[PDB]
Amino acid sequence: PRPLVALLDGRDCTVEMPILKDVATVAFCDAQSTQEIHEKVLNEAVGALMYHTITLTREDLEKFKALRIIVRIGSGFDNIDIKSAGDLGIAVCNVPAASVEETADSTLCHILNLYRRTTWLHQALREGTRVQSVEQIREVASGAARIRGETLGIIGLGRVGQAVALRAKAFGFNVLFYDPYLSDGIERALGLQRVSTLQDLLFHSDCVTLHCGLNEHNHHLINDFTVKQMRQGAFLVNTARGGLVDEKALAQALKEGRIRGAALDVHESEPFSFSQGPLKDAPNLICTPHAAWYSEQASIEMREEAAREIRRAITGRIPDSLKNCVNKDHL
């Protein structure tokens, strides 16, 4: 026999197959919740591969009897109770560096779509709006703004935020960031303005973009209180986590005009629909379905790394042989 490794919330293992064939038994559950997982997997499985569509609480984790390693195929690991997994002896790993520039490229696309109205102008043209005179060009593209001199505020200057910052310079954005965990010096090295409080960023930014991981202290970071601290007619971009923005507060802000437009790749409740939830047809909203990370290369890249992390777990030592373990402190 050889250790069982299961893909919890997927059906495809074609990319992982050549890396695990000889060291692990590969199965998949295609499960939305821990309820749909076969009793065998809970008892036998030593390894687990998962994405973002399944949440693992402390309850779910202590149903597993042989589980020693969880690898998240992708960056964020908020959907995994990493503290609880450490108590039980389960190492948690991620793949942080696979779709950094993909995400930054999609974020810049979102920013620009709000500023230049490319998506809404296409939408208008789809719906049979006729534009003849210069007067009606100005009318249909009303709100399109000049970028140079505008202030882009970045919340969380990690991998993605840093890549967004570099790209933003080229357009003429005045770039400032807020990151309470980075040590002094990053702002000087990259040549960016830095502010010390969230309100300070909100007060100065014409366009606010989110690039921080979802944690204990930042849930509903953009709420009823903090939305008011944002400038009149500011843009909001969120390609980080949906649980960071209060959708009820955002909706209200969009209708009243306090936020001129929003671009969302992530939402509080996924899958997203324009019919379901608080964002039920708020004006000036652009939404993509958690696809900012995607490209074939990035998808293969993270799956191969994830598969390699599994192999390192089975053959070598936990948590030594591991490369991208995110709960060494909880073990």
């Binding site: 703004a145 000049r146 505008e150 909100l202 014409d206 007619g233």
Partner: peptide, 9 residues
């Protein structure tokens, strides 16, 4: 500039 001051500061 283009944008105005926050509703409550």
């Amino acid at each position: 500039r283009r944008t105005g001051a926050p509703p409550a500061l």
